[PDB]
């Protein structure tokens, strides 16, 4: 048969041309033929024949081979014993093999990773070099574990990286993973899990497919299993679906997905099914979505298109069963690598070959060493045992003028990135990239709020006033505004707030100041006209030091306006909160005690002469004025110390720009406390004068007390009413206006009539007029 050819040195070859009572071990021929095995076997035979023809590569030396049709898992062991034998069938057992010479010097090994590990563990103790062409399992990189093994292909690492960089390029953030129950699926799914989270992509969910087979009928439980998986596909918002499975099993899965009326996904196919003709020919797949697949890049062998067209080394149906491009170059490069390593081991040059007996471990030591250009591609073994061959991404196309599979990207494993991506004709309405992300991006000024486990899951929430969003600093909590700034809720930046207080530019402010000035000069005129008539009965009965100092206090109190108006200072704030109210209050108290003296004192003297005898003895009225004054002192200080000596800042009720500066931030509270006692004094004096309504003893004093305290009472009640329905800037200026109006109430309503009589009814200055009352 063609499975064997002689030579000076021999290569072993294991290819899966095919696929118990357990004692009845089946022969390899008892299973269906697989065409890819014929392709790979003919690739090896072509490579060895070409190397024998090339007189410059092995001058005067012929390569041979022994090829065995290993059926993909079963009937292992026998080939390695067949290869390792010293002569005929015999293999010696000994401690050290450094001087041993096996039948073959190198093995072109199996395809299935399980079989590769099985064969490698048996070859390892001899260090007979093995090269394999399609086992992508990543565990084979452990050369402590597999010292004899090398590969002509990138490992699963680079396939997963191709997938991940495809996802990054098109910004797919949110994916689904489906795996077979095999070691292949579980391994590749965990590896994808290790690559994805590292780079910010998130897996929505992962689930294992059932191990169905295409020929047999599906059971009810398997049917429901597929239904349950497709339901989770249909419910999820993700649309990138990654499938790690052998090809044969997926026929049922895609039949079910079609039956379920599913559509709109991107399917990313792993190496095991990315190029399957049978799945591609499933007629209705084209409605489901876009199919992309990672696969090793095809390199055309020049001469192969012509060349292709006691047991386990024979076949009866191979060619007629035939009547693999992407793996053929791996097989070809493996054979050429062995040839070059042998050429180096023999120390050879054109027509100088010396035909040593070669021990496999030295051939391994040289196989690690080769570096040459083959078919316009350069192949050398990485210390981890892999040759760098390009990968590609193929989109499936259902136009049969071109090839079924169209390349759309290429992955360079040494530069380790995906390059020159081309047009992918998507399923969307206008070839817009099909998006799939867990969440919408934040609007300006919105914080993130994580949801669930995954990084991609978050709500978007507006920043509150007093905070702002700073992309340079954070996005999961808001940055606080400086103490003199603010923000318009959902905003990227702050804005400066403005202080507000009374100043003379304002019409009402200057108006109030002018009113206070009128009051001041009128009070001073009253004082001086009283002084000019100190000798008169009017000033004797309703004047003297009490009125002199009352007018002095009142005219200095009129100087409040320059202290209210203008930028505040601590001392002026203390002056407003205690001093002006204090010096104003005692005047009202004087009016009160005079209202007592005019009538109620006589009621006391007649009804309660004992109390009156005490009252006149202990200086009743002056003591009463001092007593209420000290009560007022306590009342002012206990509020001020509870609210602070310094000026205070308050927010404007509905204008975000304005901050209002004023004393007494607890206005209403103190307003009530301060007035309560003052207005009670007002009421008691008012009622006393009302009782002695027509008493003319003090030049009809009761009428004018009544008038003045009426003005005071009504103004105070009006202020308390106004404060219940307004909160804006006008508060303090209206406060000042009412203060000035009360100063006017006293200064004019009480003293003015006396001065009017002095000036314009001078006959009333005579003692003759005064005595008419007696």
């Amino acid at each position: 048969s063609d499975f064997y050819l002689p030579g000076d040195y021999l290569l072993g070859g294991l290819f899966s041309l095919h696929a118990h009572n357990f004692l009845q071990v089946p022969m390899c021929k008892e299973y269906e033929v697989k065409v890819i095995g014929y392709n790979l076997m003919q690739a090896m035979r072509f490579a060895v024949e070409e190397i024998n023809n090339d007189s410059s590569l092995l001058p005067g030396v012929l390569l041979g081979y022994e090829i065995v049709d290993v059926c993909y898992i079963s009937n292992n062991v026998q080939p390695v014993l067949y290869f390792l034998a010293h002569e005929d069938n015999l293999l010696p057992i000994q401690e050290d093999y450094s001087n041993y010479s096996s039948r073959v010097v190198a093995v072109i090994g199996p395809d299935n990773s399980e079989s590769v590990m099985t064969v490698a563990n048996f070859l390892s103790l001899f260090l007979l070099p093995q090269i394999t062409y399609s086992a992508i399992s990543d565990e084979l990189r452990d050369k402590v574990r597999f010292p004899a093994l090398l590969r002509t292909t990138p490992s699963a690492d680079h396939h997963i990286e191709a997938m991940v960089q495809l996802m990054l390029h098109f910004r797919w953030n949110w994916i689904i993973v489906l795996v077979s129950n095999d070691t292949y699926g579980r391994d590749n799914g965990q590896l994808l899990g290790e690559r994805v989270a590292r780079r910010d992509i998130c897996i929505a969910f992962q689930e294992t497919l059932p191990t169905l087979q295409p020929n047999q009928n599906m059971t009810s439980e398997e049917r429901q299993r597929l239904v349950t998986i497709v339901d989770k596909l249909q419910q999820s918002t993700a649309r990138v679906v990654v499938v790690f499975s052998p090809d044969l099993t997926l026929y049922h899965f895609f039949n079910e997905v079609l039956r379920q009326n599913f559509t709109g996904a991107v399917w990313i196919a792993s190496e095991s099914w990315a190029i399957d003709p049978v799945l591609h020919n499933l007629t209705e797949l084209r409605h489901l979505g876009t199919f992309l697949g990672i696969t090793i890049q095809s390199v055309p062998i020049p001469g192969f298109s012509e060349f292709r067209e006691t047991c386990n080394q024979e076949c009866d149906n191979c060619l007629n069963a035939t009547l693999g491009e992407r793996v053929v170059y791996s097989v070809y490069s493996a054979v050429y690598a062995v040839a070059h390593a042998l050429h180096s081991l023999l120390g050879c040059d054109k027509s100088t070959c010396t035909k040593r007996v070669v021990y496999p471990w030295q051939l391994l030591e040289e196989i690690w060493k080769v570096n040459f250009t083959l078919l316009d591609h350069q192949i050398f073994f990485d210390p981890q045992g892999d040759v760098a061959l390009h990968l590609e991404i193929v989109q499936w196309q259902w136009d049969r003028s071109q090839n079924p599979f169209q390349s759309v990207a290429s992955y360079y494993p040494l530069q380790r990135q995906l390059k020159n991506i081309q047009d992918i004709s998507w399923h969307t309405i206008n070839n817009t990239i099909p998006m799939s992300m867990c969440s919408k991006r934040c609007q300006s000024g919105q914080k993130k709020k994580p949801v669930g486990i995954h990084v991609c899951c978050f709500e978007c929430i507006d920043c509150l006033p007093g905070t702002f969003l700073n992309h340079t600093e954070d996005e999961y909590e808001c940055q606080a505004c400086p103490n003199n700034e603010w923000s318009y809720q959902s905003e990227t930046s702050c804005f400066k707030r403005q202080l507000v207080f009374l100043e003379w530019h304002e019409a009402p402010t200057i108006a109030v100041a002018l009113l206070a000035a009128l009051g001041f000069l009128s009070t001073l005129a009253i004082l001086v006209i009283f002084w000019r008539h100190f000798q008169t009965p009017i000033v004797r009965s309703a004047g003297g030091p009490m009125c002199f100092l009352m007018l002095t206090l009142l005219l200095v109190a009129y100087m409040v306006v320059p202290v209210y108006v203008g930028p505040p200072k601590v001392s002026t704030c203390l002056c407003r909160q205690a001093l002006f109210p204090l010096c104003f209050t005692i005047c009202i108290s004087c009016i009160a005690v005079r209202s007592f003296q005019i009538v109620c004192a006589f009621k006391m003297a007649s009804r309660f002469p004992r109390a009156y005898s005490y009252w006149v003895r202990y200086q009743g009225p002056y003591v009463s004025m001092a007593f209420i004054t000290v009560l007022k002192m306590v009342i002012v200080v206990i509020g001020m110390l509870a609210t602070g000596l310094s000026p205070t800042t308050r927010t404007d009720p509905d204008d975000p720009k304005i901050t209002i500066v004023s004393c007494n931030p607890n206005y209403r509270n103190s307003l009530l406390f301060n007035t309560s006692l003052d207005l009670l004094l007002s009421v008691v004096g008012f009622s006393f004068a009302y009782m002695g309504k027509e008493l003319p003893t003090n030049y009809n004093e009761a009428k004018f007390i009544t008038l003045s305290m009426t003005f005071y009472f009504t103004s105070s009640v009006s202020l308390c009413t106004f404060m219940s329905a307004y909160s804006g800037v006008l508060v303090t200026i209206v406060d000042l206006l009412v203060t000035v109006l009360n100063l006017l109430a006293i200064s004019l309503g009480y003293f003015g009539p006396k001065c009017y009589m002095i000036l314009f009814y001078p006959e009333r200055n005579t003692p003759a007029y005064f005595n008419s009352m007696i």
């Binding site: 357990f22 071990v25 898992i73 292992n76 062991v77 026998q78 014993l81 067949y82 390792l84 069938n89 015999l90 293999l91 057992i93 000994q94 401690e95 050290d96 093999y97 450094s98 099985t118 563990n121 048996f122 390892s124 103790l125 001899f126 260090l127 402590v144 574990r145 010292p147 579980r186 965990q190 899990g193 929505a204 969910f205 992962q206 689930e207 294992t208 989770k232 419910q235 999820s236 918002t237 006691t310 047991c311 386990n312 471990w361 949801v451 669930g452 486990i453 309504k693 027509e694 009428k703 009544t706 008038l707 009426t710 009504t714 009640v717 009413t721 219940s724 329905a725 307004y726 006008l730």
Partner: protein
Amino acid sequence: LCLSQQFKAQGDYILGGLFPLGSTEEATLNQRTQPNSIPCNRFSPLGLFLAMAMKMAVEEINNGSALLPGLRLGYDLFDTCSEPVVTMKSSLMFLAKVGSQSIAAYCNYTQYQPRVLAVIGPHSSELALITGKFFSFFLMPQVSYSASMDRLSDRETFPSFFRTVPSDRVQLQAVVTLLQNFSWNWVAALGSDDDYGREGLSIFSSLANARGICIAHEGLVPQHDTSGQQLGKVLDVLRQVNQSKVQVVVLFASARAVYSLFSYSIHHGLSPKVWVASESWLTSDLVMTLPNIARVGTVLGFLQRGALLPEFSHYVETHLALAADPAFCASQRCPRCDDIMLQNLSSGLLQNLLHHQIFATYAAVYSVAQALHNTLQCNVSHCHVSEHVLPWQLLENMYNMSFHARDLTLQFDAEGNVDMEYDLKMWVWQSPTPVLHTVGTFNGTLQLQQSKMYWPGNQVPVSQCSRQCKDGQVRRVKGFHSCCYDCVDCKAGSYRKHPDDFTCTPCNQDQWSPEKSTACLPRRPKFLAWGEPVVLSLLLLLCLVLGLALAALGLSVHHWDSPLVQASGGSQFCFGLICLGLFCLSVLLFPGRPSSASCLAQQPMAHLPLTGCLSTLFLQAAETFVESELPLSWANWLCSYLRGLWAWLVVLLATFVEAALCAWYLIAFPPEVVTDWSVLPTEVLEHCHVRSWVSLGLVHITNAMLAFLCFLGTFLVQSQPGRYNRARGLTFAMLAYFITWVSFVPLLANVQVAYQPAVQMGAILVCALGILVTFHLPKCYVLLWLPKLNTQEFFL
């Protein structure tokens, strides 16, 4: 001592054995480039104990008549060195033709003649895989005492591999049953990075998914503690467990990975968790060394109930003592055993827990011996010695059998496992070292002894998950598989529009919705409709006050010729009373559905008649004041001058000023009919909005000033007896006015929003009622009940 010489004995049939007797230092483990032999240079007690167990089993089998009578069963042992290369080089000598040094590559098993009947298999799972695949080609039966990994169950690739320990699948079925018993539906699953842990996760996840247990997180913990990457990985695992709000964790791992995880778990401060251990690390002689264990949380795990061998320690010490005698040498596989003395093999090492694996080795030898006993068709004390058995002939007798250990019976099942049973053992922390407490048993079902369970506190811990949302809730999936949800309640103002499994839908502006609502409900418009039960009282009061006004007007017109009315103001008095009656009726602009006309008209339409009325009372106060407080010599002139046409002039002037300020209000601060969809919980408010209440003073200041001037003109006045006192009436009237409108502001500022118009209506009504009750009512009372006073002398 002579230990190494005792590893071989002749017999009619010979058993091979692979044990972890030897090992090599870490310096040996570099990449290998030349096919030399491995320098085995260390010793272990475990390997010697297992080898002694096999020796004991074979010695007992040869002593008794119950098995293999008339035959001597031999044995010789090799060391695995825990190394595949050494393991292969050793196992090849089992297969090599007896009496020679080579093996022949025959194409099928029947042609071989191996020198051992069967192989008592290796310790670890990796070597079990490697050697089982190798032996299967020769169909030589192999019996591992330790390898529990489930992949070895497959009869297709491992047709001749057997074991005397349960597979991992049985243990994880027990674990799944435990989780299922406590309804611990929400758990994290962790495994070690070596094949045992990855396969453990693969088995457990399949079982959990099949039984509806939801795995919150699934991942692998590293085997090494050498670099910041591993620290970060374990920190990330802790983060995963923390953020998923798990409380029960399954940790199927080899011991060193668990030690690495736990040492950092103690450090990083994660809260205690329930850990379901595995037999591979629950032995925990290593784990006991941690500086703190009580903060880890409860540890549970199933542990094998193999039989005890009291004789074994005495046997070991006996043979070690014998191996000191040099006489045996007159009669290597492991050179390092010869250096070992009895003190190096103290009984404390046998009391480690290793009884499980020692007894497993004993039972393995008994299984092989019983299989041969069946194959030789033994009668009592007589074998059928007509043939010499080859291993592939013994294999067919091995599957169907049952065999007896010391006081225990076993069977190899359909795929080469044995049906052993378990104890559920848990750790309790009260003692200086943790104590293993038996708290349950598993034999295919879980026979929990729940009353003995020493939980923290006195109650079961739990982590669970909601499988189905209530109808009024929005779903959101979670878990490694999308096996379960967490629930969102529809907040008021939102509704469950669709099964959109991330978020609720906001309510429409024309509608409202309560909590847990599936769908919205339109919100009704609200305003002071006619017939509202409080407005009804105002509608009655309107008639009452208007009735008083009209009764007084009719009485005045009836007695029009009498002094009282002229003294009260004559035509001005009548006109003011009519204006007051008109003032009452302005109430009717407020109720009902608002309109653009009434919204603007209502304030002027109220205050203009009131201004007209109040002007007359102000003029009467002026009369009272000029009659009492001004010098006669021009008081008479003013009194006679202001009365008559000039009173109408004052009326017109006041009306004009009020109207001008009404226009200024209608231009500078006009109100508007506003519809509000937000200020009420289930309604839409329709109301006349005012820009700011301080702007309302434009229509007030006129009336307020007139009232204040009237009050000042009347309060001080007094009169002789025998005359009508106008001052009392005017004073009470103005006082009532001020009380009313001082009450007005704070009420309007604080009533609930929907009722505000009622306050304005009530204020108008009460003000008019006060004026009538104080100024007109006593006049008509005296006119009715005591007309005798109605004279020029009394009233003027």
